[PDB]
């Protein structure tokens, strides 16, 4: 995880890519139920700050997923060869 | 309105502060029948000065050994009494047995029915062995004891009941410093006096491990 | 002391009591005297 | 200002304004009036008892987070001998971490003094709790007015617990109500931080602290973490 | 949504209804007028649906005996522990585990018993255990008896704490019923938190505390000089020179370069050569990604957060146009019957159970277990035995719910619904399944025996003669073996010996060798098949028929646990579906004989025994392939070739093993009284004993009254079981004491 490995960059990337997902719809957030197609826009307890639902839970779940992709996509690319 | 155990706390509805040393420490609900009542008082007052007459016999033994006359420990004294004893083992437990269960079932038909044996059945008397109150008797054993004055008597009351746990608290540390140290109570209050900051229950090695 | 010796008085502890009285005394018996087959005093 | 990053709706419902803490931040939820609903005593999951345990966890934090830290400053000046200033953890509390042999006694025999005196401090404090005021009535030692106490059992007050008893008024009272807690909440940090800190570097919080200050990218989380014990 | 609903002191805490035994039920309230009274008392003492209608109330109840069952096994396991500390040779057997068989349970010299004391060798004498204890201190890295009296006395203070526990949560803090409702969050935190929790607790002591230990005991050193394992888990210099990824020291797991882990979290198959049992490693990775997986399962449902999954939306989306409406309702239920959980948990703990015996009979997974053939065939028989059990009580339960709890209002076109609409069709199919099975199996079993008798070898269902090889078990058993090669390239060999090609062996005797499948294996596990299809079939049809039937319509107004309906429509005795359960005890008795005789053989046969430099020689004269085509056969050379030990066994440290085995004869038989007869006649008998006990004035106030019909049934299923599994306990343990 040095500043500047593949690994860090993968990291970042699907960190940024989760949160860029659960900011404007387009991921089954807390404010976000998920149907078959993730609907119906819900609201509960406050964002504190920033809009949309981007609460304490929110963004721990996110980084949680992000982070676990990520596990997955290294030892992955690690397990073939690459980088 | 009485000293408790615990301060704040719920004193027992059987225990009202009219026994002597009534602190109102009773969490298992014993005694709260009025006959186990009296039962567990008279143990109580037994086992009290069972306990402060084996104390004071330990202690006047343990000073006798201490200032330089032959004594034994209070452990295993009797082991080697007996061997210089004219009463051999088996005769002397037996007739302290015997002579034992003829005064403490006199005691206990005394506690059954009060005033049982002051009819004269025993040698003829009346006013003597007779109970005063529940585990205090008369007569014989108030040669010239305070115990005619009531204040006098309740106060007496109050020292022995709180002497005899004293004491009961005192033969649990002898045998539990006895176990720890192996040797008189004596030299381990000798012991504790010399070096306080160092000599105590946590650097014997046993029971601290 | 009332209410919890009514229920030491009902029969599972009796059931216990004299169980293990007798299986005491007779445990002692066999400790302290050898296995015997006669009562030839 | 007001509220938390948590800050669970249908929990500020029952807290505002009234608590010496009462900033919003109850994601869970435990100090709902309906938990611990009925008669009696009943459990540990109250209001009261929360607030109880919550200011005692606090100045509890605050003496250990002074005493952790109060000898190693000074054994790196000159104002305690550093053959006493020694780690907090390498004192005696842990042994496998070092104890220190120069003592005037045995660590237990320490141990029993402080079993002791306070159990006899909690024991008083767990029946002032059951009973207010009930520790004035039974006489301990002619000193039975300094634990007539308050009506909330947290907070005695009285001739001894606030012997200089400023803070009458009841906004100087509520503001140092607040730093209180506030500095009690920074303490449970501060101790949460010294035992991380003991058991990442096996160092001092301090020596932690000039670690950092000398070269923050090369002795922080990252490396520590990847470093020799731990 | 998700809270902690608790009311404070519901119940008094006092003596009050332990003075009157009767208290709980209402019927037994009034007095003990006949002898039944208290075989009601202690039979309705813990069906807690009839004392009240409340089902908080009953929540409440099932939570504290849980916890008095937790305190009472937590008692257990710490006796255990301090019977290791104090009577045992656990010392001598960690220096030598190959010649010194463990012993945990020392008699008293009180009567004759000095006998029992056996030369288990180290200069220690006692009982020869069974349960594998030594095995398992030996894995979980434990040298001294301090350490074993430390873990007993904690497990006595959690036991305390328990028991305290289970105190306060019913008679001083009782949860209401919407916090026992709260099944996601119930979900949540026993997925992630105790399963994960505990797999990720148990995967860090073994990579700090067992992994240095049982490196330094294969190796030669003695556990005296080994050092204690806080060494280990303190000081990172003595765990480096064990495994050189320690000093790196942590930093490969947040940098993701998990390979640097390959030596301590190896993944390899087969078992460790110098003890007989798995690398430490791989279950250290295995428990490691197993508290993984439950850490990501544990925060699937949806609580307080918005987010997750609500089980009720999972279950009324899965609908399937065979099946109507599809599982609409089955939330309420499960939400609202503690029974309908009490089956599903039940029948789930038995399978897996059931699949831990096979798996530690496949895969031992303690040093010097799989040499230790004795420890072996108990764990084996035993999760086997409880497996069967928790399977038989979760038919039950699920007949109790059926009759109690079932209603018709929230099901009207859901899979329940349709499953009793069609319940003829399904135990017509299974009795037909049944007589298949049981003609093409048991007959050809007694056709081989026909042909044998016959003097006809060659036309025997045998290996010499017309064979049935059962293709599809042993090209499984070829697929795992080649597995390694390519659907798993790294896997270091097979992941079990059952279908590999090298014998490993330990102390001279063999740990695990491949097994070879022929068609005595084929009619044993087809025999097998049938049998539990059997047991199925009496459980499924138990509970389909409870609530009603086509000659009882009203069996659901009847009870549960009722003897009959009366002599009438030719007589419906055992009608009930407690009966059902009653005979599917039997009939679970029987395949659980079968199958774990069938374990014994074959393991004696062609698994264990002792190697030697010509050949491999079992304890058997390997006679399975053989021998186990015919009912003379199997009952020769299993039963009458083995239990010679058990007949000699007298005036030797196993005659104990005799003693129960005649024992468990006689309580197997005596349980046919209350089997064969009926009620009349012992109560007309008890008339009998009565008028003479009126004679002379001894007449008891209490009516002496006999047994009731299910009262009977039930003394006779419990006396039968408790005879048959003491009598393959005493034969097995013997027979694998005597010659292992
Ligand atoms: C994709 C972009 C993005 C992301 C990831 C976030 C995420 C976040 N912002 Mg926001 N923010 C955004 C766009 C975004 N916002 C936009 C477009 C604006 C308007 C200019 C803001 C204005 C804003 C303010 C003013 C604050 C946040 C805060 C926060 C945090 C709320 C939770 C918390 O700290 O309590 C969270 C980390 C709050 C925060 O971090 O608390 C200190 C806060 O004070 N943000
Ligand atoms: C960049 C994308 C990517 C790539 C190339 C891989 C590639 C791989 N991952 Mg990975 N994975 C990814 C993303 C990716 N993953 C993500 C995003 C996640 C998170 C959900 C995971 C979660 C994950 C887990 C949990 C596991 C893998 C495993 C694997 C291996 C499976 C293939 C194999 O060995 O033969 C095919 C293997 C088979 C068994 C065939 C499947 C046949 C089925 C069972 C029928 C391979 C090295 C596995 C592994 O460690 O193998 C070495 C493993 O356990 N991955
Ligand atoms: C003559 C023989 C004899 C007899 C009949 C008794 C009988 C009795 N003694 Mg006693 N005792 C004896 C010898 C005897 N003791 C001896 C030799 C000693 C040693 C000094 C004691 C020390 C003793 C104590 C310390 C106590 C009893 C107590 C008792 C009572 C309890 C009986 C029981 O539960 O068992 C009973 C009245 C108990 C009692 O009186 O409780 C009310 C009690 O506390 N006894
Ligand atoms: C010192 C403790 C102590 C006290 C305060 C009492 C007090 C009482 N007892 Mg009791 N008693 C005691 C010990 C004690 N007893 C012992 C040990 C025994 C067993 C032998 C008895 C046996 C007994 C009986 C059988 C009866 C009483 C009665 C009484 C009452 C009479 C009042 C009286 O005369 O005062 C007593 C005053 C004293 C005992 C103080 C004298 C203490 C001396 C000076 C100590 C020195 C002697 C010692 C052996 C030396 C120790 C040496 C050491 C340093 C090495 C009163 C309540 C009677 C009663 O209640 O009737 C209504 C009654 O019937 N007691
Ligand atoms: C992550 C949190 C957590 C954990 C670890 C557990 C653990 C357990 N629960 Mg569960 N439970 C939880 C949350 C949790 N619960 C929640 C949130 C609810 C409400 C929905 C319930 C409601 C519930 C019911 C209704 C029942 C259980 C039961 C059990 C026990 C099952 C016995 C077993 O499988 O053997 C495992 C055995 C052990 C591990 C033995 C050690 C037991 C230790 C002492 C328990 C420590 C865990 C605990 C959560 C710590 C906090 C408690 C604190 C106040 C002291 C097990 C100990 C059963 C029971 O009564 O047993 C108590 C049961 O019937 N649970
Ligand atoms: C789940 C069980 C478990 C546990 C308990 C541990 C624990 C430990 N491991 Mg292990 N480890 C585990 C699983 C586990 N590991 C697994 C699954 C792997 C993967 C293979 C590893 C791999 C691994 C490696 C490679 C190494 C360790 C090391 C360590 C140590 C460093 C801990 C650390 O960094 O935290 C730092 C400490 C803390 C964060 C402290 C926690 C906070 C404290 C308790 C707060 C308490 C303060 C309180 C307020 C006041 C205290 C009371 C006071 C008044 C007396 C520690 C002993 C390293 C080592 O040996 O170092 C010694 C090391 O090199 N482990
Ligand atoms: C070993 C003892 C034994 C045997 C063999 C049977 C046999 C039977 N019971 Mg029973 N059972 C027994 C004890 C036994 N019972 C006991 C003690 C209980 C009480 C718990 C029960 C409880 C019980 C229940 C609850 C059920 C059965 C059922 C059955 C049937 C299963 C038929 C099947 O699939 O196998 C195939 C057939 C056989 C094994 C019979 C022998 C066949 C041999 C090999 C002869 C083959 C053909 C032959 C050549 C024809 C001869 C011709 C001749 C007339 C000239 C069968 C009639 C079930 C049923 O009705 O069927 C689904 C059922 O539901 N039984
Ligand atoms: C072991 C023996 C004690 C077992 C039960 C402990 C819990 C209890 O009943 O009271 C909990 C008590 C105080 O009761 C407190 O009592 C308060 C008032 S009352 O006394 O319950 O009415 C109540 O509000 C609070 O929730 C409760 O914690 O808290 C303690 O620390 C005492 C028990 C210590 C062990
Ligand atoms: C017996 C007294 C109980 C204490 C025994 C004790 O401390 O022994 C330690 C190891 O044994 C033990 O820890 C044994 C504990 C059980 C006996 C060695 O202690 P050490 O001399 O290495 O102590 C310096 C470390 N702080
Ligand atoms: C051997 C036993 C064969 C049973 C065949 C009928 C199964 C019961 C049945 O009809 O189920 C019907 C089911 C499809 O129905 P649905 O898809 O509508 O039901 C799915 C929901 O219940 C979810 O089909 C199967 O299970 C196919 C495999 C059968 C095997
Ligand atoms: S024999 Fe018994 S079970 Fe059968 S119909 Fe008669 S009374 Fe009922």
Redesign the interface.
């Known amino acids: 995880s040095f500043i500047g490995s593949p690994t860090n960059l993968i990291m970042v990337s699907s960190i940024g890519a989760c949160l860029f997902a659960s900011r404007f719809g387009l991921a089954p957030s807390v404010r976000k139920v998920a149907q078959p197609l993730k609907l119906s826009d819900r609201e509960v307890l406050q964002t504190t700050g920033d809009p949309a639902g981007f609460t304490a839970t929110d963004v721990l779940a996110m980084g949680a997923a992000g982070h676990a992709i990520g596990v997955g996509i290294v030892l992955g690319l690690k397990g073939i060869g690459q980088l | 309105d009485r000293?408790?155990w615990?301060?704040?706390?719920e004193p027992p509805a059987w225990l009202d502060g009219s026994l002597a040393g009534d602190y109102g420490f009773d969490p298992l609900?014993?005694?709260?029948?009025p006959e186990?009542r009296k039962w567990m008082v008279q143990a109580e007052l037994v086992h009290a000065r069972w306990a402060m007459l084996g104390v004071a016999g330990i202690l006047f033994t343990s000073i006798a050994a201490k200032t330089g006359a032959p004594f034994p420990d209070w452990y295993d004294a009797g082991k080697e009494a007996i061997k210089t004893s004219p009463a051999p083992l088996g005769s002397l437990i037996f007739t302290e047995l015997l002579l034992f269960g003829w005064v403490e079932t006199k005691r206990l038909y005394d506690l059954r029915n009060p005033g049982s044996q002051g009819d004269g059945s025993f040698l003829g008397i009346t006013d003597g062995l007779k109970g005063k109150e529940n585990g205090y008797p008369g007569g014989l054993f108030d040669p010239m004891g305070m115990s005619k004055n009531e204040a006098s008597y309740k106060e007496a009351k109050v020292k022995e009941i709180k002497n005899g746990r004293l004491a009961m608290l005192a033969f649990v540390g002898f045998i539990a410093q006895h176990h720890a140290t192996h040797k008189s109570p004596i030299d381990n209050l000798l012991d504790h006096v010399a070096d306080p900051?160092?000599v105590?229950?946590?650097?014997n090695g046993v029971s601290?491990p | 002391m009332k209410d919890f010796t009514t229920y030491l008085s009902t029969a599972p502890v009796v059931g216990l009591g004299w169980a293990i009285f007798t299986s005491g005394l007779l445990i002692e018996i066999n400790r302290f005297f050898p296995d015997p087959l006669v009562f030839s005093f | 200002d007001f509220l938390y990053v948590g800050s669970d709706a249908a929990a500020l419902k029952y807290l505002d304004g009234t608590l010496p803490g009462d900033y919003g931040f109850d994601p869970l939820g435990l100090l709902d009036p309906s938990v611990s609903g009925g008669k009696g005593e009943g459990g540990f999951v109250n209001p009261r008892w929360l607030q109880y345990s919550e200011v005692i966890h606090a100045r509890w934090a605050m003496l250990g987070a002074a005493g952790c830290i109060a000898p190693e400053i000074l054994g790196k000046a000159g104002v305690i001998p550093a053959e006493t200033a020694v780690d907090w953890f390498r004192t005696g509390v842990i042994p496998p971490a070092g104890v220190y042999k120069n003592f005037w006694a045995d660590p237990f025999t320490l141990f029993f003094i402080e079993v002791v005196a306070i159990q006899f401090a909690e024991l008083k404090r767990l029946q002032d709790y059951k009973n207010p005021g009930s520790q004035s009535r039974q006489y301990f030692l002619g000193l039975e007015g300094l634990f007539k106490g308050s009506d909330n059992p947290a907070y005695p007050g009285g001739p001894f617990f606030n012997f200089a008893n400023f803070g009458k008024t009841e906004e100087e009272m509520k503001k140092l109500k607040l730093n209180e807690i506030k500095n009690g909440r920074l303490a449970m940090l501060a101790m949460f931080g010294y035992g991380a800190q003991a058991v990442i570097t096996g160092d001092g919080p301090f020596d932690n602290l000039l670690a950092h200050l000398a070269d923050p990218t090369g002795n922080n989380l990252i490396t520590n973490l990847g470093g020799k014990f731990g | 949504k998700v809270k902690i609903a608790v009311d404070r002191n519901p119940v008094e805490t006092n003596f009050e209804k332990w003075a009157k035994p009767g208290h709980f039920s209402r019927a037994l309230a009034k007095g003990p007028n006949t002898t039944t009274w208290i075989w009601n008392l202690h039979a309705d003492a813990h069906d807690f649906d009839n004392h009240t209608s409340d089902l908080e109330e009953i929540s409440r109840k099932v939570f504290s005996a849980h916890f008095g069952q937790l305190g009472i096994i937590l008692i257990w396991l710490s006796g255990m522990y301090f019977h290791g500390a104090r009577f045992s040779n656990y010392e001598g057997w960690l220096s030598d585990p190959t010649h010194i068989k463990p012993s945990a349970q020392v008699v008293w010299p009180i009567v004759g018993q000095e006998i029992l004391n056996g030369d288990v060798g180290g200069g220690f004498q006692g009982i020869q255990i069974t349960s594998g204890f030594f095995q398992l201190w030996r894995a979980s890295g434990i040298t001294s008896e301090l350490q074993l009296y430390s873990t007993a006395i904690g497990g006595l203070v959690l036991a305390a704490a328990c028991f305290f526990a289970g105190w306060f949560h019913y008679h001083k803090a009782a949860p209401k019923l919407e916090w026992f409702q709260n099944v996601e969050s119930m979900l949540n935190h026993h997925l992630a938190g105790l399963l994960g929790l505990g797999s990720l607790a148990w995967a860090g002591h073994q990579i700090h505390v067992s992994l240095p230990v049982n490196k330094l005991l294969d190796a030669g050193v003695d556990p005296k000089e080994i050092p204690l394992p806080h060494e280990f888990l303190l000081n990172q210099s003595i765990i480096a020179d064990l495994y050189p990824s320690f000093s790196k020291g942590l930093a490969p797991f947040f940098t993701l370069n998990w390979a640097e882990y390959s030596d301590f979290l190896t993944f390899k198959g087969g078992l460790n050569p110098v003890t007989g049992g798995l690398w430490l490693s791989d279950t250290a990775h295995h428990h490691l990604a197993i508290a993984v997986l439950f850490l990501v399962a544990g925060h699937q449902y949806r609580t307080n957060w918005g987010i997750g999954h609500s089980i009720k939306d999972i279950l009324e989306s899965h609908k399937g146009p065979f099946t109507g409406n599809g599982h609409a309702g089955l939330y309420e239920i499960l939400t609202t019957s503690w029974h309908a959980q009490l089956a599903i948990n039940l029948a789930l703990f038995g399978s897996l159970s059931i699949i831990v015996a096979h798996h530690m009979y496949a895969m031992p997974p303690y040093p010097y277990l799989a040499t230790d053939y004795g420890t072996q065939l108990s764990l084996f028989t035993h999760h086997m035995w409880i497996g069967g059990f928790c399977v038989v009580g979760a038919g039950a339960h699920a007949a109790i719910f059926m009759v109690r709890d079932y209603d018709p209002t929230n099901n009207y076109n859901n899979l329940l619904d349709r499953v009793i609409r069609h319940r003829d069709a399904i135990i017509s199919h299974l009795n037909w399944v049944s007589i298949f099975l049981g003609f093409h199996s048991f007959g050809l079993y007694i056709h081989n025996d026909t042909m044998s008798a016959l003097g006809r070898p060659q036309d025997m269902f045998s290996d010499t003669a017309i064979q049935l090889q059962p293709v599809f078990a042993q090209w499984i058993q070829n697929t795992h073996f080649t597995a390694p090669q390519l659907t798993a390239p790294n896997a270091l060999a097979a992941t079990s010996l059952t279908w590999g090609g090298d014998v490993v062996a330990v102390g001279g005797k063999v740990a695990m060798m491949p097994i070879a499948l022929g068609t005595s294996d084929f009619l044993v596990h087809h025999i097998h098949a049938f049998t539990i299809h059997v047991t199925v079939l009496i459980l499924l049809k138990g509970v389909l028929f409870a609530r009603s039937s086509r000659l009882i319509p009203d069996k659901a107004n009847l009870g549960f646990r009722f003897p009959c309906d009366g002599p009438g429509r030719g007589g419906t005795c055992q009608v009930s579906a407690w009966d059902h359960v009653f005979l599917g005890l039997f009939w679970m008795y029987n395949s659980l004989s079968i199958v774990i005789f069938h374990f014994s053989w074959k393991m004696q046969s062609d698994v264990w025994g002792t190697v030697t430099d010509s050949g491999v020689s079992h304890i058997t004269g390997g006679n399975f392939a053989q021998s186990a085509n015919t009912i003379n056969g199997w009952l020769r050379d299993f039963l009458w070739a083995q239990s010679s030990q058990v007949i000699q066994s007298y005036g030797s440290a196993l005659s104990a093993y005799g003693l129960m085995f005649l024992g468990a004869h006689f309580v197997w038989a005596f349980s046919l009284m209350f089997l064969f007869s009926g009620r009349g006649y012992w109560q007309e008998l008890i008339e009998s004993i009565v008028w003479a006990h009126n004679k002379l004035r001894v007449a008891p106030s209490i009516q002496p009254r006999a047994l009731s019909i299910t009262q009977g049934r039930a003394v006779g299923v419990a006396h039968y079981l408790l005879g048959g599994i003491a009598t393959t306990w005493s034969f097995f343990l013997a027979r694998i004491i005597a010659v292992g």
């Open positions: 000293p408790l615990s301060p704040g706390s609900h014993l005694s709260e029948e186990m900051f160092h105590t229950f946590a650097t601290i």
